[PDB]
Structure formats: C-alpha cells, structure tokens
Coordinates of C-alpha atoms (C1' of nucleotides) and ligand atoms in Angstrom, one line a residue:
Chain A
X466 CA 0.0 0.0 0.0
X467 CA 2.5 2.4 1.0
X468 CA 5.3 0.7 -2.0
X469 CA 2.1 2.2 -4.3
X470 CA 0.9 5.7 -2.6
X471 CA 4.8 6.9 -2.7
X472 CA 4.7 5.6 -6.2
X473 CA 2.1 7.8 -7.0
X474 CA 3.6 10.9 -5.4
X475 CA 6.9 10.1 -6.9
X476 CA 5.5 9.7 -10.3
X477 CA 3.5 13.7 -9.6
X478 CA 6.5 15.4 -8.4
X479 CA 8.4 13.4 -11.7
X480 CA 5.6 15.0 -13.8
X481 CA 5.3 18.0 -12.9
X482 CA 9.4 18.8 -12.9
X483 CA 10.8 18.0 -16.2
X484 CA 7.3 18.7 -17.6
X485 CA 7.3 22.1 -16.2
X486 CA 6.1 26.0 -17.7
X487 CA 4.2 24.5 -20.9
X488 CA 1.1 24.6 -18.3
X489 CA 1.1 28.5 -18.9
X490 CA -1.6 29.1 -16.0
X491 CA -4.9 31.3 -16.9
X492 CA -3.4 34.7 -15.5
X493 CA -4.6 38.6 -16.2
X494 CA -3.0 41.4 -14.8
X495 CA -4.3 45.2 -14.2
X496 CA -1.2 47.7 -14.6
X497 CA -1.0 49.6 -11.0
X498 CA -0.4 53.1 -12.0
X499 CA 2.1 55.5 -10.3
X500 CA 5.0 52.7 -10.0
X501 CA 8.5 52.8 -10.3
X502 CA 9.0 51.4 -13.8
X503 CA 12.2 49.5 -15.1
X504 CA 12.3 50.4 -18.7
X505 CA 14.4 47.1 -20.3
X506 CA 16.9 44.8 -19.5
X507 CA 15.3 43.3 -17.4
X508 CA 11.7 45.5 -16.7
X509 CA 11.1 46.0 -13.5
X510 CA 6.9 46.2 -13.0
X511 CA 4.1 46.9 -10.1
X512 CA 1.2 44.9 -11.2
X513 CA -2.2 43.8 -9.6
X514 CA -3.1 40.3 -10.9
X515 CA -7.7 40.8 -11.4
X516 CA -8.1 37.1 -12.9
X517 CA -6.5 33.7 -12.0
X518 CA -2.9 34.0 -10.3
X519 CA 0.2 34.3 -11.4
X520 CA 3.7 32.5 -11.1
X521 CA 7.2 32.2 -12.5
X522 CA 8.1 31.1 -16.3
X523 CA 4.0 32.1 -17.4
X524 CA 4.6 34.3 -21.1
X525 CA 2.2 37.1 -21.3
X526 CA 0.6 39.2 -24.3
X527 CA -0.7 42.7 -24.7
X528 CA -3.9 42.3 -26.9
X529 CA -5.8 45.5 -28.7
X530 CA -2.0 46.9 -29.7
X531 CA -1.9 43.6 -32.6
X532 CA -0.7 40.5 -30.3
X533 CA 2.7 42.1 -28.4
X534 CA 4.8 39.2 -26.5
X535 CA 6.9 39.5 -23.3
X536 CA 8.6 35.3 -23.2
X537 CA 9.0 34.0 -19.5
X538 CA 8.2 36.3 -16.4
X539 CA 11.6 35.0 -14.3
X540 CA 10.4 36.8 -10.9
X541 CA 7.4 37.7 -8.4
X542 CA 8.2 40.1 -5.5
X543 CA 5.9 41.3 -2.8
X544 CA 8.1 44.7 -1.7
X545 CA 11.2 43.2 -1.4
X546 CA 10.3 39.0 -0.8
X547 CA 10.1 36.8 -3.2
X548 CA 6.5 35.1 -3.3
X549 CA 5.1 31.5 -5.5
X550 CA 1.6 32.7 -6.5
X551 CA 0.2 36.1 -6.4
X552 CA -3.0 36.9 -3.6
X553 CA -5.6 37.6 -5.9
X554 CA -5.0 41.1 -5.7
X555 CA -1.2 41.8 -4.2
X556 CA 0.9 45.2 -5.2
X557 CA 3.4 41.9 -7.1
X558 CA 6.9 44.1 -8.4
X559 CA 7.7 41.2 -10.9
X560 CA 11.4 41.3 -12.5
X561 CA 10.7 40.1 -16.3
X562 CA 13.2 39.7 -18.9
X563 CA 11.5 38.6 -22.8
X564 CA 13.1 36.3 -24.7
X565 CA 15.6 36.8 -27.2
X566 CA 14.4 38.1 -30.3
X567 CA 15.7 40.9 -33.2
X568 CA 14.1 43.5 -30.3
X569 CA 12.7 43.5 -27.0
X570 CA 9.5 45.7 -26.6
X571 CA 9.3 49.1 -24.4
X572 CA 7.1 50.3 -22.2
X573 CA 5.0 53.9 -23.5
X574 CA 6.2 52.8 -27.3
X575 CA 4.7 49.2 -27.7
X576 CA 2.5 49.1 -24.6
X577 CA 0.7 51.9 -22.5
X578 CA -0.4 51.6 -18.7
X579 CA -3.9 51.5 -20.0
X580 CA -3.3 48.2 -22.1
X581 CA -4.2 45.0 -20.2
X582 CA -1.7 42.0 -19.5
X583 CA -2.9 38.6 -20.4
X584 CA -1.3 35.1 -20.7
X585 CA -0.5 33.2 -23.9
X586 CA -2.6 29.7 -23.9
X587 CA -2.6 27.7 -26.6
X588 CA -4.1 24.3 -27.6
X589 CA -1.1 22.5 -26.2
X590 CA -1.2 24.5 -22.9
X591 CA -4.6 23.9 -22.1
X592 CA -4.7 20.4 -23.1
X593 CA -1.9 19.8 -20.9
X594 CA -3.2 21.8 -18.0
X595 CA -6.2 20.1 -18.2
X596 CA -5.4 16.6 -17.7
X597 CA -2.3 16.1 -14.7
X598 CA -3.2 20.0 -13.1
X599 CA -6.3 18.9 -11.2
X600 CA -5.4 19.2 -7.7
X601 CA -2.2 22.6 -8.1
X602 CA -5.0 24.1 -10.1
X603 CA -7.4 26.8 -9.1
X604 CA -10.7 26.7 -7.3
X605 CA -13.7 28.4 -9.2
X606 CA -12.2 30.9 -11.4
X607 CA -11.6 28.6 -14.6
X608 CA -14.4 30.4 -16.6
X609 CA -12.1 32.8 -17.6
X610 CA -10.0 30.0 -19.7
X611 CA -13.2 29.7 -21.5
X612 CA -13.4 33.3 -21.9
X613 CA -10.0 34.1 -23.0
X614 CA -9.4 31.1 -25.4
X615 CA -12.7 32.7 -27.3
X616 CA -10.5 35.7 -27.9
X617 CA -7.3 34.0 -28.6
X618 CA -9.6 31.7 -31.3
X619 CA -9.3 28.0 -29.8
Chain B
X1 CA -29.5 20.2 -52.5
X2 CA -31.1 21.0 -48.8
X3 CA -29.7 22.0 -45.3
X4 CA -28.3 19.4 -42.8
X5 CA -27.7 20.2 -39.2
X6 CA -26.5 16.3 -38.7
X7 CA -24.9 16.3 -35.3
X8 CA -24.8 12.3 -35.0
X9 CA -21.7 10.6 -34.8
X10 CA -20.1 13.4 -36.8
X11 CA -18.7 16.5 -36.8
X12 CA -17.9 20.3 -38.7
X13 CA -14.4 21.2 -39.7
X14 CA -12.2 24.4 -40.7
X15 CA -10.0 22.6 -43.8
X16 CA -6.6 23.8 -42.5
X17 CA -3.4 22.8 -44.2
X18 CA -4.5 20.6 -46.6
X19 CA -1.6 18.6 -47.5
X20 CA -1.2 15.2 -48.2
X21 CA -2.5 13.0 -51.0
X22 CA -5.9 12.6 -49.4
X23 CA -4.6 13.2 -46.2
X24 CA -6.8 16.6 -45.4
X25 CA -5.2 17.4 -41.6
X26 CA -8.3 19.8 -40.5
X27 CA -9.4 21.4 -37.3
X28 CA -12.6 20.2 -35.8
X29 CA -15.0 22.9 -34.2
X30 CA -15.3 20.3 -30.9
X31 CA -12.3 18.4 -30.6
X32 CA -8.6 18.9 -31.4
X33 CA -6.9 18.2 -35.1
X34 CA -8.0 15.0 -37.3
X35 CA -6.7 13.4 -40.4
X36 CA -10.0 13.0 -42.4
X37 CA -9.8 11.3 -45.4
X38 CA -11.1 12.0 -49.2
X39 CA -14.2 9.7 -49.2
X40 CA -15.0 7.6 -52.5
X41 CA -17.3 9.9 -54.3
X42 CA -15.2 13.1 -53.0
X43 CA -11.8 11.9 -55.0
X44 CA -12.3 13.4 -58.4
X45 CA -16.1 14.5 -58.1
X46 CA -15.9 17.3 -55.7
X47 CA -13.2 19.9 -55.2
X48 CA -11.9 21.2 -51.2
X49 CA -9.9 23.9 -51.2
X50 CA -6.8 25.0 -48.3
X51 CA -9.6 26.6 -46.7
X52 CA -13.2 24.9 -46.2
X53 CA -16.0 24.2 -44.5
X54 CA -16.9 20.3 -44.1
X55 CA -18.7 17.9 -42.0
X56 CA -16.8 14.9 -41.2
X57 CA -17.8 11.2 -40.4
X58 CA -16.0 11.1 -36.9
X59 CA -15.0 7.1 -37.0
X60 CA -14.9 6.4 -33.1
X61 CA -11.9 3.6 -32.7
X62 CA -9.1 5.2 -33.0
X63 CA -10.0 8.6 -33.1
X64 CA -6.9 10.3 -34.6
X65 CA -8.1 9.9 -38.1
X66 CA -12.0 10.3 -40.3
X67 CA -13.0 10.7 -43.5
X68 CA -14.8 13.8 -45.4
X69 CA -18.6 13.1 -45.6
X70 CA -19.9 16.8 -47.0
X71 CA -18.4 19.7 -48.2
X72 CA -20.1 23.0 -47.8
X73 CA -20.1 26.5 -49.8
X74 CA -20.9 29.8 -48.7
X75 CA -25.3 29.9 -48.5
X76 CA -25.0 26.8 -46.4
X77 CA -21.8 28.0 -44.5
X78 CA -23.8 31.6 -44.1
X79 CA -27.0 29.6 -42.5
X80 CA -25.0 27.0 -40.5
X81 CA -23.7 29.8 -39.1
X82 CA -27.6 31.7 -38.1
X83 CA -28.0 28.1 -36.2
X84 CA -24.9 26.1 -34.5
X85 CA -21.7 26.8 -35.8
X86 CA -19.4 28.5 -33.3
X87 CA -18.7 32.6 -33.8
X88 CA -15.4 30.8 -35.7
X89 CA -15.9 32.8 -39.5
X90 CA -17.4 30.9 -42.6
Chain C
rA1 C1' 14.1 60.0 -20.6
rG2 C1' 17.8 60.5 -24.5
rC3 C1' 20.1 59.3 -29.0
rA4 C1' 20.0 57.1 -34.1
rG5 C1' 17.7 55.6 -39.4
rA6 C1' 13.4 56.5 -42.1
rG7 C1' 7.8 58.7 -43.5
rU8 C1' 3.5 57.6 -50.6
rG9 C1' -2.0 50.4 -50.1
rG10 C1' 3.5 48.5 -51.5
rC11 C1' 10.1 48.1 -53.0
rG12 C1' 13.2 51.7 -54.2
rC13 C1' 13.9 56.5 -58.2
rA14 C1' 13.7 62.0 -59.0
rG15 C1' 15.6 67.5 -60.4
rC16 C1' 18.0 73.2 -63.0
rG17 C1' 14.0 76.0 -58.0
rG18 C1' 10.0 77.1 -63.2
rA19 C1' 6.3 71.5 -63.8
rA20 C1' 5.8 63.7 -60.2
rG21 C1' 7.0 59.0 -63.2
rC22 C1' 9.4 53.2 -63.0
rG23 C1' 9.4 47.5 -61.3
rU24 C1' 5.9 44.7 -58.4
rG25 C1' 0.9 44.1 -56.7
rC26 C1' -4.9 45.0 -57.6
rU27 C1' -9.0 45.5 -61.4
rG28 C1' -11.6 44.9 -66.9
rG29 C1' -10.8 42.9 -71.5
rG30 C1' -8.1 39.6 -75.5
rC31 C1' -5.0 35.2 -77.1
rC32 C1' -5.6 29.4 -75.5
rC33 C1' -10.3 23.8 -75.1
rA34 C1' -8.0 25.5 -69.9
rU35 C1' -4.0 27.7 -66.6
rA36 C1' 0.6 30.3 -66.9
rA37 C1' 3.5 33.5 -69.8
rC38 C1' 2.4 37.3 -73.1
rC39 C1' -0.8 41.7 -75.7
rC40 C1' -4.2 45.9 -74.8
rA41 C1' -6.3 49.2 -71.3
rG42 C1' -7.8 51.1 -66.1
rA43 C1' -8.1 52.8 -61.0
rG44 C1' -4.7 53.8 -56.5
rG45 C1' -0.6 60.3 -54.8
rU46 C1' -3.4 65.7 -48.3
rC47 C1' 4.9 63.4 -50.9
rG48 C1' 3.6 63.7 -42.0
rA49 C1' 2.9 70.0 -39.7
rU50 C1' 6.0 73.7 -42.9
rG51 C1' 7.3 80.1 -40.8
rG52 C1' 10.9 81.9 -44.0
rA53 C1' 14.0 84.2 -49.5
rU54 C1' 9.8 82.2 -53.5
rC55 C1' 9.8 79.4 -59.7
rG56 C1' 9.3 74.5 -53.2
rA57 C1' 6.2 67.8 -51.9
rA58 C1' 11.4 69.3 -52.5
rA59 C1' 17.6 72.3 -50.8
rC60 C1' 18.3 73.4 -45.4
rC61 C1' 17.7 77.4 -40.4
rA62 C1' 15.3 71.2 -39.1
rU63 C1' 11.6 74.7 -36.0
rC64 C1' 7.9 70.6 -35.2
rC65 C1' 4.9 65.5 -35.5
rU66 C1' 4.8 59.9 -36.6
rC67 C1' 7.0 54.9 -36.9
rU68 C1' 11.3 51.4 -36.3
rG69 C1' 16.0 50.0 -33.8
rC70 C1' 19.6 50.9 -30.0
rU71 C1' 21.5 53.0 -24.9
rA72 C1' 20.2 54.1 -19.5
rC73 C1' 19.0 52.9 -12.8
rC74 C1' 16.6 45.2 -11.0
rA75 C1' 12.2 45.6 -5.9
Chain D
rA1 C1' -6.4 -61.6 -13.7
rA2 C1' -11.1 -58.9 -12.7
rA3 C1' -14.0 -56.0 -15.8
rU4 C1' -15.0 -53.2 -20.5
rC5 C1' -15.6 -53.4 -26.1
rC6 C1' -16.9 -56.8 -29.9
rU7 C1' -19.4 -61.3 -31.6
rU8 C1' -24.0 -64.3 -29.8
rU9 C1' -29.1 -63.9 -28.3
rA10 C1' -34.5 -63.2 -25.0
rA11 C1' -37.8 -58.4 -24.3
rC12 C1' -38.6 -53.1 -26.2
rG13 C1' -37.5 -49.8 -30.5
rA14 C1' -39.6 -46.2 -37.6
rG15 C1' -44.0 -42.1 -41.1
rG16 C1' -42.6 -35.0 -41.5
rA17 C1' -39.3 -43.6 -40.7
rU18 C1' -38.8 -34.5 -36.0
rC19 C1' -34.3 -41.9 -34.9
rC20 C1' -33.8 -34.6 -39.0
rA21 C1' -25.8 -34.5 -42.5
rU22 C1' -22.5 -31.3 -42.3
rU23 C1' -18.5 -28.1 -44.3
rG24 C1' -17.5 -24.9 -48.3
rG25 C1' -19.0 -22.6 -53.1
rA26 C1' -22.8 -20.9 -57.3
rG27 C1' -18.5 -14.1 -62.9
rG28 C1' -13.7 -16.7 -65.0
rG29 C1' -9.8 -20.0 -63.3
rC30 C1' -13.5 -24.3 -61.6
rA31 C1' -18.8 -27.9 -61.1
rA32 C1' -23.3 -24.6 -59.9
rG33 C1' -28.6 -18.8 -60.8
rU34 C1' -28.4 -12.3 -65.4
rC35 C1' -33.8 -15.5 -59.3
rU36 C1' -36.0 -12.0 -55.5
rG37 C1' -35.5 -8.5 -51.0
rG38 C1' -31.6 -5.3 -48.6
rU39 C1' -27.0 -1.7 -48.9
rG40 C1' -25.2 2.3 -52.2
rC41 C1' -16.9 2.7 -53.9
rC42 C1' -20.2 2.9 -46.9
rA43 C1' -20.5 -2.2 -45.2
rG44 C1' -17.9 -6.0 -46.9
rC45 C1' -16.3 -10.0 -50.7
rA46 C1' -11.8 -11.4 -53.5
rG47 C1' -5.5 -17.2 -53.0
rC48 C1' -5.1 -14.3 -58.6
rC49 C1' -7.9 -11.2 -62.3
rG50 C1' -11.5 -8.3 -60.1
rC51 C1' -17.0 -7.1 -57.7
rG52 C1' -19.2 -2.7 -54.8
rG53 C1' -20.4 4.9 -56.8
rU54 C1' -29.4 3.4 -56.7
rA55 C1' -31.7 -2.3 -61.8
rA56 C1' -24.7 -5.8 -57.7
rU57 C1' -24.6 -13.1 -62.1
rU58 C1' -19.3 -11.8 -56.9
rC59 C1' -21.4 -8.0 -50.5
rC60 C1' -25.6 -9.1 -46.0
rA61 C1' -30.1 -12.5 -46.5
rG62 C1' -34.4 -15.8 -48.6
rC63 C1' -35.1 -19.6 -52.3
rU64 C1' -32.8 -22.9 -55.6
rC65 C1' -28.4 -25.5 -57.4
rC66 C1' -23.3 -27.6 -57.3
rA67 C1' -18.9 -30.2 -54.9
rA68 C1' -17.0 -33.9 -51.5
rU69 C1' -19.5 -36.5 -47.7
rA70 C1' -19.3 -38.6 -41.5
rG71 C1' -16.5 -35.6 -42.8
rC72 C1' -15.1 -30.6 -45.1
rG73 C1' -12.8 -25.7 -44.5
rU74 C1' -8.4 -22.4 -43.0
rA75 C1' -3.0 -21.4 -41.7
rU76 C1' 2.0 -23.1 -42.1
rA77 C1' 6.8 -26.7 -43.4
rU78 C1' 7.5 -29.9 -47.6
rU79 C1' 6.9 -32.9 -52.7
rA80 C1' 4.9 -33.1 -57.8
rA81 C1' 3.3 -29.2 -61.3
rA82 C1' 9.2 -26.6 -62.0
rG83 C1' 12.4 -28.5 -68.8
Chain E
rC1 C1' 22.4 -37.9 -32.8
rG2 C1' 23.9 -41.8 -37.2
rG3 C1' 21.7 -46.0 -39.8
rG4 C1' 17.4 -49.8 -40.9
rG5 C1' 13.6 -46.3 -43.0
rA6 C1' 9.3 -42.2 -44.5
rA7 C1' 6.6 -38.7 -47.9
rU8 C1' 6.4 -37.7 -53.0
rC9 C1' 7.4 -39.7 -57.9
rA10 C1' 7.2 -41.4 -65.8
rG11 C1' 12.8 -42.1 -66.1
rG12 C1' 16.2 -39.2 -63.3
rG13 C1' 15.4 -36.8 -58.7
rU14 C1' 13.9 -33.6 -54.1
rU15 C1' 12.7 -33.5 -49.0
rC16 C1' 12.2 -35.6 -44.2
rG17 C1' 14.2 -39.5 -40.5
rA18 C1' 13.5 -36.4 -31.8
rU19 C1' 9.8 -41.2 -32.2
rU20 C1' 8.8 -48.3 -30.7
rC21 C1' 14.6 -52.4 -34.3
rC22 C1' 20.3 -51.6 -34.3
rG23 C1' 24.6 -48.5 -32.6
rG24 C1' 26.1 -43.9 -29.8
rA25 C1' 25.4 -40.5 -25.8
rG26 C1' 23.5 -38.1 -20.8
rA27 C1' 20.9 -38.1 -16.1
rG28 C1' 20.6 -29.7 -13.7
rG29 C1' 26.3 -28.2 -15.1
rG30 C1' 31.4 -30.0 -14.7
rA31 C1' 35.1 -33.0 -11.9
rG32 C1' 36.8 -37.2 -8.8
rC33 C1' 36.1 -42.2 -7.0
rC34 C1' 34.4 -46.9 -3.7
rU35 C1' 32.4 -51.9 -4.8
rG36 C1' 32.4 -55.5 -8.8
rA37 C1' 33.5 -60.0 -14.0
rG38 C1' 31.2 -55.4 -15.9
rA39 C1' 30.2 -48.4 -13.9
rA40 C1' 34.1 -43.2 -14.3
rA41 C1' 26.9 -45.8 -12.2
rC42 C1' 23.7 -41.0 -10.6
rG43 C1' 16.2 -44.5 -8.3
rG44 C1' 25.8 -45.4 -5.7
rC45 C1' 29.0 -42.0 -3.0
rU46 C1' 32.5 -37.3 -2.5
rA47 C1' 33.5 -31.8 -3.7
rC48 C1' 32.5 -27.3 -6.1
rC49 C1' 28.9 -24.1 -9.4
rA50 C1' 23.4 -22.9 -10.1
rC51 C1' 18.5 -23.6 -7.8
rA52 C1' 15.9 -25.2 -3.5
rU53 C1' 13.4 -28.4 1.3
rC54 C1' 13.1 -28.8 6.9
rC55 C1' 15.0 -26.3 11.5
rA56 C1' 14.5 -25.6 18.4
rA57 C1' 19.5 -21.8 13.9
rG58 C1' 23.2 -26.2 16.8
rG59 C1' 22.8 -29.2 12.1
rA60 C1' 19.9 -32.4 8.5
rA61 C1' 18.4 -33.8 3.5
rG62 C1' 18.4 -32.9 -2.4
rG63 C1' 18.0 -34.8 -8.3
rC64 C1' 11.1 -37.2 -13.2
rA65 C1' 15.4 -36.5 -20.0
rG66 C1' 11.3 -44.0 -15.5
rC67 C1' 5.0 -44.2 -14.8
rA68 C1' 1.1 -41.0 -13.4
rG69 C1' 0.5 -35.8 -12.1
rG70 C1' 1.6 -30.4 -11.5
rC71 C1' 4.0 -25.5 -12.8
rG72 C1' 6.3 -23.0 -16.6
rC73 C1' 7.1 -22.4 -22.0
rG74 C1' 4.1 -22.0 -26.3
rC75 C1' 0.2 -22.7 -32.2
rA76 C1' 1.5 -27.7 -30.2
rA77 C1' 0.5 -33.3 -26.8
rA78 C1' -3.8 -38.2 -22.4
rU79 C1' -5.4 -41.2 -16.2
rU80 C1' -2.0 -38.9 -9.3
rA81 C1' -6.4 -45.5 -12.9
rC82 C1' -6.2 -51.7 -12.6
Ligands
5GP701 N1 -7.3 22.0 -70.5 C1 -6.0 21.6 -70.3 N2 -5.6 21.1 -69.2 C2 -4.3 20.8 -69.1 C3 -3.4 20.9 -70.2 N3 -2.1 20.5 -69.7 C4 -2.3 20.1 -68.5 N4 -3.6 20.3 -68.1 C5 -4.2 19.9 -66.8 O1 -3.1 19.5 -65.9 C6 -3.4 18.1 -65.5 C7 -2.1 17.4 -65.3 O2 -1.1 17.9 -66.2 P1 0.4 18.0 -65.8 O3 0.7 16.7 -64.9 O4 0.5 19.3 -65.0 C8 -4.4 17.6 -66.5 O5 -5.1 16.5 -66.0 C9 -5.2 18.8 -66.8 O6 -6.2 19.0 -65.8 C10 -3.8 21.5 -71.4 O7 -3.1 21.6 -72.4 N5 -5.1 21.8 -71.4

RNA sequence: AGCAGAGUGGCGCAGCGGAAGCGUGCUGGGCCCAUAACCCAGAGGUCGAUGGAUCGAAACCAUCCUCUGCUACCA
RNA sequence: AAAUCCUUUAACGAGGAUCCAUUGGAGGGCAAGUCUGGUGCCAGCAGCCGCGGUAAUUCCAGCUCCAAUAGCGUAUAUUAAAG
RNA sequence: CGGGGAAUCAGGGUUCGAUUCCGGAGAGGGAGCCUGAGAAACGGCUACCACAUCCAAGGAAGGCAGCAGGCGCGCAAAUUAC
C-alpha cells in the first residue's frame, strides 16, 4: 500500500518537474499606475493580478496593440520578498526579462499603462493543464480559460 | 441540394493545411486536429480547397483519423452559421 | 528620458528651383479547349505639420509630428 | 487376472421412418442462378484477375443448385506441377 | 544424434528421418572415486557451481530427460487408474 501511494507521489513530483512552464496558468493582470517602472533589461513592474494567479516562467501578451509578447516572467516580488503565486489582488513588483528576439518591446512605445496584460494559452497548454493540473489548479475561477481562449480563437 | 444540421456521430471542420494526397489534416470545431480522409465519391467529383467548411464522419476507434462526408459553400456555411456553428468565421 | 535611421495600399527613383513617373501588386478585356506567360487598357498620390528668400512635396535654419532600432538605474 | 468393447441372443424400438448431415461454393480459373428483398466505392467479398459509386450473375439475407461426404474448410513446413 | 527407413514420384530426382529395431550418448552443469567380472553408475557416493526443502539456527536432506501428475514455456500433446 504504501510501496504504491509513494509511487504515485513520486510519479506527480516526476511529472510536474521536467514537464514544467508549458502549463502557462490562466493569469490577467491590471497595470497599478504610479509605479517605479524599469524600462528594459530586465523591466522591473508593479502589477495587480484581477483574474487567476500568477507565477514564474508564465509568457504574457498585450492584446488591442496587434498580439505584443513579453517570453517567461523570471520573478514575483511582494516589496522586497520573493512570493510562489500572487494573492488575488497583491501590489506583485515582478522582474521580467523577454526572450531573445531581433528586439525586446518598451514600455510607452509598444504598450501603454492602460493596455491590459494577459497570458499566452494555446491548444497544447490547455490540453496539458487540463489533464495532470487537477489538484495545483485553481478553485472556481476557470471560466475565464473559457473566456480568454474565445479571444485568442481555440 | 437541402440544409443538414446532422450532429450524429459526426462533426464540422475548418480545412486547414491541406496537404497530403488525401490526407486533409483539419481542425474540428469540438475536438482537437483530425486526419480526415477524401471519401470515394469526393476523390475526383468534388473539389476542397486549403480553406473549407466540411462535415466529417467522426469514426470512433481510434480517433486520430476520419474521413470527409460533406463539403459546404458559402449559402450553407452563411445559414450554418444563423443556427450552431461556433462565432469561428465561414 | 535621451540618441540614431526613415515617413506615398506596396520596394526603391527623382531634379535646374520654373512642372511627379518606373518594377511589383490590384481590377476589366483579348489570345488558348483551360492555366501560366504574353498583348491591350484602367483605378490607387493631403509626398507627416511647414514660418521663412519664393519658380518649393522638395535644398536646409530642421523649428515641429509619426513609426522602427539601440542606450540608460533590478524591488 | 477382474472388468470393458466386440461377436452371440431373450424383451422393447420407424411415417414429417422430427431416430432430422454437415463443411464450403454458385462471374472466370472451376462444377453450380443475369432469381428475388436489402445496402449504395459505406458495409464487406476477392489465393489471382477483379465485384461494390441506386436495376450488384461476386457483399448481407431468402429460395434454388453444385462439390466432397461422417466428414469438409483455414494457416504453415514440404513434394509433384518446376524442362 | 547416425543408420534400418518415411513422404512424394514417368525415367532421373527432391525433402524428411527427436519417435517403438540396431549402434552412440547423458541423467541440472562440470570433476573425482568406492564396490564389482562389468560403472568413471547418478532411483551409488565425494566436492565445487546454479537452484531449493526442513530447522529448536546447533545441524539435516536434495535430483522425473522412468510411470502418473503439477507448474512454466508455447500454435502444439492423455489417467495422481487396474
Ligand atoms: N485544358 C487543359 N488542361 C491541361 C493541359 N495540360 C495540362 N492540363 C491539366 O493538368 C493536369 C495534369 O497535367 P500535368 O501533370 O501538370 C491535366 O489533367 C489537366 O487538368 C492542357 O493543355 N489543357
């Protein structure tokens, strides 16, 4: 019995590691004005998460403005501490540096405090989100999933 | 030829990247990807394009491949979309 | 925040200061049984705001607005 | 050896003599139906050639017929056909 | 395993022969030996190698490729009878 239960854990924590950030995580953030912005390399930004929450290694998109990309958010900071998931509402300054590409976007050029920040889920993410993320994933806020796959055409 | 909103044992698909030699590879307004293949009467009869609307006869063994049962035009496509047919573009 | 390389659906050309056209794309014909290629025609221009000596969309005193790329302090 | 089976022999035992003959075929190879329902290049058949896309001589069935017969299919090693 | 043979077949041939008769070999794998006319014997012993039985943990006892029967292996093979 015990030989079988550990199995089981054993066989999670091997899943999830190794298998890790492809799970995106449904996450949109409202911009909390007034903040001490980091303009590139790496941007430095004071965000208020209003659906889902948000952790390390999620990519996130700026819709309305085409389909802007920042790749991989690397850090979540309350203040000063380093946090795992955001509070449903925290004052998060998260460290993020995009991907290499031929540019990295800017802040005021690209993207405006107005525009809103949402995650980039695809077919792949959901689908593997949906089966093995049943007991890490949230509550009674997956609607939004629904709601934002609509918009990203899925 | 008439309307028909068959929803039994088969389903509508967006022709995506249709490459193959009868291999079709489209996107099913349900479910995930499917290979569905260029049914008897469909190989030199009727013509679909790299972008179509098609209702598919979902074979439930496997479920990674089907074949093509119907292909659609614009009228149909344009009325299919008044009843069920997701806000997906026709 | 600053700097830099450019502004016509779309790639570049242009002057002597009198005065705006080329390749490609789009549309309508023809040739062919049919497509392509070819042969005829068509539409598409506030040359980003210009104050100036004026024969200025222009050359610059670049004054100013837009877009793209780069540099700058990690809570 | 003791039994069994057989042979022998009283009694019982045949009119859908319901005391019931199957396994494969019926386009050609290759003996036997261009008969009638069903399906509509879907389902399937087909060793090979081929048959199926709305009058299917070939599929699923009914009827009829052919082959061998208490047996007859199918797969696989091997022999003749193989000069 | 080898022969005597088997299937097929004009003549020539081809293929099979673990299997009831003859000869050879081995008793899980090797090795060494006692007794006896005859054995390098395994329903004799001695040791090691591989497996495995009992146990009071001190020690003890193993050999179906004999007839039944069981497990395994696999497409593939019978009764713990008199
Ligand atoms: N009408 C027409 N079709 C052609 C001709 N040449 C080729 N085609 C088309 O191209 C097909 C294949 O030709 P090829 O292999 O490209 C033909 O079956 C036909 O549809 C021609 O001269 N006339």
């Amino acid at each position: 019995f015990d030989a079988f239960t550990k199995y089981r854990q054993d066989y999670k924590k091997q899943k999830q590691e190794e298998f890790k950030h492809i799970a995106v995580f449904p996450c949109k953030i409202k911009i909390l004005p007034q903040y001490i912005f980091n303009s590139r390399d790496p941007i430095v930004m004071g965000v208020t998460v209003e659906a889902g929450q948000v952790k390390q290694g999620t990519p996130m998109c700026v819709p309305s403005k085409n389909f802007v990309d920042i790749g991989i958010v690397t850090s979540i900071e309350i203040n000063h501490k380093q946090v795992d998931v955001a509070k449903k509402g925290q004052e998060v300054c998260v460290k993020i540096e995009p991907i290499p590409g031929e540019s990295p976007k800017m802040f005021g050029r690209h993207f405006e405090a107005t525009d809103i920040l949402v995650s980039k889920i695809s077919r792949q993410s959901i689908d593997a989100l949906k089966d093995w993320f049943r007991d890490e994933m949230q509550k009674s806020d997956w609607q939004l999933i629904v709601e934002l796959k609509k918009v990203f055409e899925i | 030829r008439e309307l028909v909103f068959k929803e039994d044992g088969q389903e509508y698909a967006q022709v995506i990247k249709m490459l193959g030699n009868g291999r079709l590879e489209a996107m099913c307004f349900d479910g995930v990807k499917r290979l569905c293949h260029i049914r008897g009467k469909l190989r030199k009869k009727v013509w679909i394009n790299t972008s179509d609307i098609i209702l598919v006869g979902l074979r439930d063994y496997q479920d990674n491949k089907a074949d093509v049962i119907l292909k659609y035009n614009a009228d149909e496509a344009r009325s299919l979309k008044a009843y069920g047919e997701l806000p997906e573009h026709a």
